[PDB]
UniProtKB/Swiss-Prot annotation, chain A:
GO cellular component: cytosol
Enzyme Commission identifier(s): 2.7.2.3
Binding residues for AMP: 214-215, 219, 238, 312, 343
Source lineage: Eukaryota, Sar, Alveolata, Apicomplexa, Aconoidasida
Record organism: Plasmodium falciparum (isolate 3D7)
Record's protein name: Phosphoglycerate kinase
């Protein structure tokens, strides 16, 4: 369902054909200067394979930020065109509009084998389907108009390449609209599906999910679905104290208690025993007398519990130790979830040590996947990106996929 | 299972007399130059405020959001003009405060008429409400987790009793929805009514329970369709979707009509589950087709067997399919409706959805419980002004969808029992 999709590295003879590539260019910009060039850098291998493979034109469509169907100086793709010139060694044509009888007239009769970037897709209301007007009121797009926009994209090119995995969860016009015969994943999309398929379709057992973060309540379905696929789970960092008070009536102090989530842990634990999943909650905690880096700290176990005005912010050394046997015996791991407040040096040991083990287990041969933001922020703070099998770029779609969702942008691809 | 409804409400709440009550309201309302162009959402909270008022209550502190300011004070989304509207509706003074937490707010709340209504400014001006935001430049910014902690405990300081009358942001776990850690957490009159009808229809419904789904895409409604098939007895799939179903299942010559490439790959899986679960599926059998996606185009009628000629498109259900709604709808004892049966925004292609609506009106009077999932289906009921002829027109976008998709709704879970 997820790993049998047509990819760019199979498109026999794309020579002399017009290619539309949906890319992810949602980059940090600050006074017209791109603060982080990492996306777009990631786009080159697909742009380049199209170059060396023939290809009359290479049309690039993407979005930046959330402009909500209105034009907006703040979210232009123009500085992205500037950067691409330095990275390709050629002039890049940047057009101020996405669709029209005039833009397909500037693509045609523009240097052969060249790349063209079109202006932000979300400047049109018909990309998403909904907008907000000049005053800040939700506007909905005419159905006639969305249909027209999708027809206009479809006639910009001959072949559609989708290299924007971070939007595949949205059923937007660029995801489900380009109705050409050949619809293939770019290299980025390819690598996303390849690994997610490797861990979700037919993984090699045991299969571990490391979950973490503050709330239990937004990660309900994320847990529910996983308990079907997963062999073992580590629940940690914040959401653990909710599990602890509800299951072991542990004294929690002023630790983050998720009242919405507290209602459902019983349900989760029932499904867990039912699906035969090992659970591994923390067994001990580093606690502090105030939620900041520079506060007094000590250690308590699950049975001693937490003093009445103190709070747990990281797993204790024994829980850390306890995930030596859990991670190292696993032949595939899905992470996504810090094991405490890693942004805070003192209360970071847990997440850092967890990473060291995942790096190690990858070295031992296992397949490892890092999920959303935060966890990736850690992987990138530590500069360990490629000691892990895969770190998913964009947590919109990666969460949804791990959640059990279908992903419209993946289904729109050929086979 | 079980969690929806059987929750607490203002109704059946003793000991409200002399208490500071924090009410989470839905004031996300259309505005131009400080002039609220539709006050429905505001008048809707009047029962809640009134009952609280009429019960004692030292203070009635209102917290809400307007639009998507993304964690920054932004003038186009200030709640000030609402306070001006509430003054007109309650016939008294209403205190509007620029902040929503902190030292000063708590003091200025305390020194105010001992039965007063106070409106605090847009929650979403604080990054900690949603949890994420965007900075002045346009780049995504994530909130510090200890700042959320302070924000959530600050809102809890504001009052003694919490009342949540903002179904519609129940599907999101924002600070104002799961952060007010007070002993008494109860639903408002609007919330109570949402929770009441959905459980009435999704837990122990009068059978036969009918779902009516419609719209352009089928690729985004997969989770909706799937979760509904294990609780429903009848289902009508209409307008836009229908074609994607008709080409996959009946090999229909479909014309230029809307085809969902993403969705066609799932039609199979759906019909298998529908048969497994013994759910009758109803699909249009004739169509109104045009030679152009435009009102006042050329129109004629064709059966699915005749098929749509090339370069023509189906834009509405045909007369026999419309006629065929009678027996499906009028024999149902409970109806869930989330999707128009055609391009109803064009008079020429609205006969389907309108005639559907009249039949849903007709079965309500026959004693059935009818619910409009709405958004797009809602605006039709509005346009026809028949919002009263239906048991419940859900006043919630994504929260009603995620509930009908079988998800959990943090806002709800966080209420007392």
């Amino acid at each position: 369902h997820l790993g049998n999709k047509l990819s760019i590295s199979d498109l026999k003879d794309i020579k002399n054909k017009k290619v539309l590539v949906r890319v992810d260019f949602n980059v940090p910009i600050e006074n017209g200067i791109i603060k982080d060039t990492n996306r777009i850098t990631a786009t080159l291998p697909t742009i380049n394979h199209l170059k060396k493979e023939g290809a009359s034109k290479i049309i690039l469509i993407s979005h930046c930020g959330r402009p909500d169907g209105l034009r907006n100086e703040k979210y232009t793709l123009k500085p992205v065109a500037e950067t691409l010139k330095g990275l390709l060694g050629e002039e890049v044509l940047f057009l101020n509009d996405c669709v029209g009888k005039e833009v397909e007239d500037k693509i045609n009769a523009a240097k052969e084998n060249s790349v063209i970037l079109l202006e932000n897709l979300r400047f049109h209301i018909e990309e998403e389907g909904k907008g907000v007007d000049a005053n800040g009121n939700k506007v909905k797009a005419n159905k006639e108009d969305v249909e027209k926009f999708q027809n206009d994209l479809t006639k910009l090119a001959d072949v559609f390449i989708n290299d924007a995995f971070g939007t595949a969860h949205r059923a937007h016009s660029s995801m489900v609209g380009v109705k050409l015969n050949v619809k293939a994943s770019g290299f980025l999309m390819k690598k996303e599906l390849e690994y997610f398929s490797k861990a979700l379709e037919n993984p090699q057992r045991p299969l571990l999910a490391i979950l973490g973060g503050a709330k239990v309540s937004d990660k309900i379905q994320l847990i529910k679905n996983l308990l079907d696929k997963v062999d073992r789970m580590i629940i940690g960092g914040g959401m653990a104290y909710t599990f602890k008070k509800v299951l072991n009536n542990m004294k929690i102090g002023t630790s983050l208690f998720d009242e919405a989530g507290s209602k459902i842990v019983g349900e989760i634990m029932e499904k867990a025993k039912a699906k035969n999943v090992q659970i591994f909650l923390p067994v001990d905690f580093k606690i502090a007398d105030n939620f900041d880096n520079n506060a007094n700290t000590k250690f308590v176990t699950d049975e001693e519990g937490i003093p009445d005005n103190w709070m747990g912010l990281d797993a204790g050394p024994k829980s850390i130790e306890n995930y030596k046997d859990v991670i190292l015996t696993s032949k595939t791991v899905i992470w996504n979830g810090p094991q405490g407040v890693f942004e805070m040096p003192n209360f970071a040991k847990g997440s850092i040590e967890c990473l060291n083990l995942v790096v190690e287990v990858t070295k031992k041969g296992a397949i490892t996947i890092v999920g959303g933001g935060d966890t990736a922020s850690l992987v990138e703070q530590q500069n360990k990106k490629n000691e892990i099998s895969h770190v998913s770029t964009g947590g919109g779609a990666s969460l949804e996929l791990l959640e059990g969702k279908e992903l419209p942008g993946v289904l729109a691809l050929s086979n």
